Amino acid sequence: ETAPIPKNEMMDTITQYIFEMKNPNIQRITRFLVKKHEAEFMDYPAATKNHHEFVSGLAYHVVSMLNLAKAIADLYPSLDRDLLYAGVILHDLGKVKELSGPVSTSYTVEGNLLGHISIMVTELSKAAEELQIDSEEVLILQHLILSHHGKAEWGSPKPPMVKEAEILHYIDNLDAKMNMMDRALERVKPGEYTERVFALENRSFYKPTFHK
Amino acid sequence: ETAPIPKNEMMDTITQYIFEMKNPNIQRITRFLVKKHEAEFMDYPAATKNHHEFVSGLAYHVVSMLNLAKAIADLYPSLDRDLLYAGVILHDLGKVKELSGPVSTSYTVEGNLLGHISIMVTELSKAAEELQIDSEEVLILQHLILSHHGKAEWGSPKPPMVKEAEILHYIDNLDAKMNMMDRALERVKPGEYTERVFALENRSFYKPTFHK
Amino acid sequence: ETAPIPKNEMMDTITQYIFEMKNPNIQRITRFLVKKHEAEFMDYPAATKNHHEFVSGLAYHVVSMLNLAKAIADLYPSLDRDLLYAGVILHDLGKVKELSGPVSTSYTVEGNLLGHISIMVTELSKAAEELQIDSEEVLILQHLILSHHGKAEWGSPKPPMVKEAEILHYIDNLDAKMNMMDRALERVKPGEYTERVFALENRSFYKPTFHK
Amino acid sequence: ETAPIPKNEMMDTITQYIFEMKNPNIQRITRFLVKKHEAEFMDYPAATKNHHEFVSGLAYHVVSMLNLAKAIADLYPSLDRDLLYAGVILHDLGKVKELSGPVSTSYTVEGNLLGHISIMVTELSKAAEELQIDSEEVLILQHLILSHHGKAEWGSPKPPMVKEAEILHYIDNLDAKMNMMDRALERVKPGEYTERVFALENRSFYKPTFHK
Amino acid sequence: ETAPIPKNEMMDTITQYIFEMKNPNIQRITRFLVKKHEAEFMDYPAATKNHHEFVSGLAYHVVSMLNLAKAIADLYPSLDRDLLYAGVILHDLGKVKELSGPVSTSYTVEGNLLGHISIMVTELSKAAEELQIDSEEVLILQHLILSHHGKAEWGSPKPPMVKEAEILHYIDNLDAKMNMMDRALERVKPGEYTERVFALENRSFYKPTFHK
Amino acid sequence: ETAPIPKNEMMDTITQYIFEMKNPNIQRITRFLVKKHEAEFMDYPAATKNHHEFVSGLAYHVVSMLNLAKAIADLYPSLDRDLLYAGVILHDLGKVKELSGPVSTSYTVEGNLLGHISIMVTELSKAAEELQIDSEEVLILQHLILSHHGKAEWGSPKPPMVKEAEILHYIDNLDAKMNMMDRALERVKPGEYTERVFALENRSFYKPTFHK
Numbered sequence A, B, C, D, E, F: 001e002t003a004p005i006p007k008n009e010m011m012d013t014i015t016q017y018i019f020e021m022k023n024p025n026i027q028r029i030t031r032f033l034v035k036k037h038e039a040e041f042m043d044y045p046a047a048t049k050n051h052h053e054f055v056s057g058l059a060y061h062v063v064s065m066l067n068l069a070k071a072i073a074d075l076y077p078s079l080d081r082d083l084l085y086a087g088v089i090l091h092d093l094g095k096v097k098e099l100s101g102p103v104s105t106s107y108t109v110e111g112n113l114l115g116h117i118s119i120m121v122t123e124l125s126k127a128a129e130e131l132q133i134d135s136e137e138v139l140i141l142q143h144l145i146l147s148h149h150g151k152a153e154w155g156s157p158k159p160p161m162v163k164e165a166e167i168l169h170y171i172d173n174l175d176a177k178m179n180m181m182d183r184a185l186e187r188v189k190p191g192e193y194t195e196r197v198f199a200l201e202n203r204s205f206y207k208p209t210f211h212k
């Protein structure tokens, strides 16, 4: 099973959203981290089970999240476009090294002991040190990476403390939940319930009779 | 303090979104409950504290959630536009009878004992019985109004079980949260923290130095 | 398996307790909702599993709770007997439409999506509108219906706020818990433990050696 | 403030309930613990705050719970009347040594460090050793004393595992709740709410307009 | 499977630590309860599953905790050595009557209904009465045994309030956890994970490649 | 207020424990990070409130935990001494950049937004890259730094999975708790209680009458 949109269009639209950025530090760091991690970002999945488990699923996750972030930021002008876009591209980038590969997905030792938050934080700091960038945008992106899961029980070391962090958390939940929730409702006749999914707090969903 | 958009434009946009509806039963029921509760919907606030405590705040809340629902539904074609729009309009309608008025906001006996969910379930069923509609559309709207707070600890009798119910939950969270978060960060200089807000799990927020 | 007391004696005792009522509005509304839902109240069970799963179990549940409520109201004169009796009779009425029937018990779409609480709030309000009764006893009975489970995690939208609501809670839990504990303790030799039942917080019970 | 019933009638009715017991070991042990702790049982309060804080309030607690246990035992014949009565009498006996006295009630070192449960388990075993009684009745009474608070978070070392233990817990909760709940409702006009009480999970209670 | 150290050397070391004590009351009580419960102390295990499930395992638990308590007492002079040693010896003594025996370990009715805390507190107070000791030493040891599990959810009636109670809690955690967690990593090759053990909050452990 | 031990003896004993290490990679990385952060490690405190809030408190915390880790490593030979010592030295090193200084302690933007865990993981990765060390001991130390608070609710991104991680967690608990719990008991007459300390789950502590 592959993504519905082919991979090089996803790469082109992500590069276009890089080109749309205005803050030079943000675009430089994000373009570097996408460019050096290009193949694994374009191939690897975004989890092991229950969401985005297909090949090039990370890329589809990223593109859908940027589209919905563009919608939210167009409706609410108070947000920063560039910081949000960099945070939404870079937040699940660390799973290029947490997971083993597109074939026979498995947690490696580094991702199982560390996690995709802390490995991406240190990768971001290393990129900032290499590109001779020592401004506050690095630390704010590092926070966006740090707290995109929202709460301590789900893996965040710290609660979100910036507007863009809460935006990132809500878009992540909505996108992942909608993808698994559309996958759950596919093989169900209208008027029938769905299978008991696990990552949706152990719930069963109803397809109404009027959805054709 | 009033809403930034004057009130009759909000009413015009809500009636426009009524006219955009395709399902006859949904459109008829939603138009009835909008028309009969018109003045209190256009005047009353949408809470007592920490969000939408100003006059005609319910109308701004509803219009903002319709706009963001339009964005999400345009990006995800799987959702039903009509059911989502009706669930957005009717979910905080009950606070026209839970709250006392735009002046000296206070919980009445009916709102404090019952709540804004169980009062609109009853109101929706009365509207369905009066307009001679006995379709599953009514029951799915009862679910949308029933579980829009998302979890039992926040006031939901049941967990959400339909797609538009979870979208209702997330849109309500995001709109209320970003309104209270923008109200918190208005009077804060860049590089300074904000006041410790209560509705956001007792947290503080940092305004970055590059936000002008 | 049937109830130990035959059904028309249960109906006669419930009608006698209706006749013992002194408040005209309470008596009229309660008699209407008993008379209109008579056959399903007299046939349907009171749950699906772990308690009152036999035919005419709802009637035995109601009669046993009325006996307990008569005892508690006799010892404590501060309670209102009329409101308590009505809240006892009406609180599990909703499972005439939540459940499918005495044979092959299953949750219907209305009961699974809404629940037995929110359907009886609506039914009670509709009965009040039909009998031209618009007094506060309807609202207090709606609270009794609303919060008879007591806590949010068990399905109550609001915590109890009136005395008879907490009495409804404690009589409900005591009656259901005693019946499931008696059913677990039937087939156990003294000096032996019971099966690990699920509805009692996953516990086991010891039958003492001197219980014959 | 004294109990509504004078003290010597209360001692007489407790001795009458001793006489009504049929099991010789239960009757002997319970009479021993009532006799040797007589004055402090008849004088001391049953808490420091929020319930039974008046002089001779422990006796009122015991008498009211005997009456409620008699009602529940008359309605449900499966329970053992004697062991339930002994558990009702002996469960809050330990506060004769947890509390300092009727005047200036305060926790002593033994009650604060150990608790009223573990001190009555010890007292019960010492009385059993002194009266040359080595039957399972003693151990079941020790379990009644051990788990009368129901859950670990409220002070019970173990969950209840006997029918009379759960009936002990529910009678204790209902009587303490009723006394604090009637004391909250004394000074409140009809149609007015009550003061925010602490031990009722931080709730406010409503007096309906028809209670005179 | 037996303990690595033979039993009579272990009894000799416990007797040596008894002789090391300076407080006469503590030393007398602790020697009395070691002497009278000697054979079952030297034979019985210290749990049913997941830790110290082998014969003479309770003795190994006690001896290792005395050694580690000696370490903590040597580094931290503010602790009382005698009180700590007595609390370490006597906190799992009660499982000589909770468990059935070294062969076919099973919970008896006394241990399952009551627990090893409440039976051991009673044993301590009975020995205090018999040895004609009425000092605060008995009450502080009663608290040490009462709250050695640390929290209410794990079985403690009261939270620890004395220094040696927290010390006993932490040494008990560290010793039991280290024995179960050394037993988990015995059969695991370097670079491989361990079996998902239940007593360690359902976690898995990694053996590093450089551990030979 | 200063630490009881003057500072250069603490530096000498930490350097001695560095010299006692046998693993070359561990020893090199740990000496590099101690030497580079030397002055702030020797001056800064280890928290803001409730523990180690005095000047040079980090050094005293580190020295006491090394002594206790030496005790545990001597008693339990299965542990790795070098990895444990490095994890004990480096776990609160990040507070040289989280905190402002020994005078007027306050959280900086980096420490408050990120935390001392994720800063120190990044510093470990940078030190490994600079010293040209790319072996798994870096990753195991990174996990030691990551999970030394033990649970998600206290700030750990991941649960501990290596033996030295659980040992580091327990020694951190014991040392911090003991210093705050000795500080609470200094000004209390024997036979009197202590003030309710916040960091110990709001408990009150008793000083026994026989402690002189």
Ligand SMILES: [Mg+2]
Pocket (backbone or CB within 6 Å): A091, A092, A116, A148, A149
């Ligand atoms: Mg993530």
Ligand SMILES: [Mg+2]
Pocket (backbone or CB within 6 Å): A061, A091, A092, A172
């Ligand atoms: Mg994502």
Ligand SMILES: [Mg+2]
Pocket (backbone or CB within 6 Å): B091, B092, B116, B148, B149
């Ligand atoms: Mg709402």
Ligand SMILES: [Mg+2]
Pocket (backbone or CB within 6 Å): B061, B091, B092, B172
């Ligand atoms: Mg809303």
Ligand SMILES: [Mg+2]
Pocket (backbone or CB within 6 Å): C091, C092, C116, C148, C149
């Ligand atoms: Mg119910």
Ligand SMILES: [Mg+2]
Pocket (backbone or CB within 6 Å): C061, C091, C092, C172
């Ligand atoms: Mg019921």
Ligand SMILES: [Mg+2]
Pocket (backbone or CB within 6 Å): D091, D092, D116, D148, D149
């Ligand atoms: Mg009690």
Ligand SMILES: [Mg+2]
Pocket (backbone or CB within 6 Å): D061, D091, D092, D172
């Ligand atoms: Mg009581």
Ligand SMILES: [Mg+2]
Pocket (backbone or CB within 6 Å): E091, E092, E116, E148, E149
């Ligand atoms: Mg234990």
Ligand SMILES: [Mg+2]
Pocket (backbone or CB within 6 Å): E061, E091, E092, E172
């Ligand atoms: Mg132990």
Ligand SMILES: [Mg+2]
Pocket (backbone or CB within 6 Å): F091, F092, F116, F148, F149
């Ligand atoms: Mg730390």
Ligand SMILES: [Mg+2]
Pocket (backbone or CB within 6 Å): F061, F091, F092, F172
């Ligand atoms: Mg530390």
